[PDB]
C-alpha cells in the first residue's frame, strides 16, 4: 500500500516491512498530523502523542 507524508501532496510507498498506514499527532493539535508513514504493526497512542493506522490506500 501507499501512505502520504505530513504534507498530502508528496506520499511514498510503505517500506520493508511496512506495509500500513499510520498518521501520529501531537498534543500540539490532534486535529493536524505531525507525522505520516507507513507501519506494520499499529502503534499504541499516548497522551502525548496520537496513532491512527489505516489498511487503506493514500488514507493518511
Known amino acids: 500500500l501507499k501512505c502520504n507524508k505530513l504534507v ?12 500500513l498506514c499510520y498518521k501520529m499527532f501531537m498534543m500540539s493539535d490532534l486535529t493536524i498530523p ?13 497522551l502525548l502523542v496520537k496513532y491512527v493506522c489505516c489498511n487503506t490506500d493514500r488514507c493518511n
Open 34 to 46: 505531525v507525522k505520516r508513514g507507513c507501519i506494520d504493526v499499529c502503534p499504541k497512542n499516548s
Open 8 to 19: 498530502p501532496i508528496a506520499y511514498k510507498t510503505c517500506p520493508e516491512g511496512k506495509n
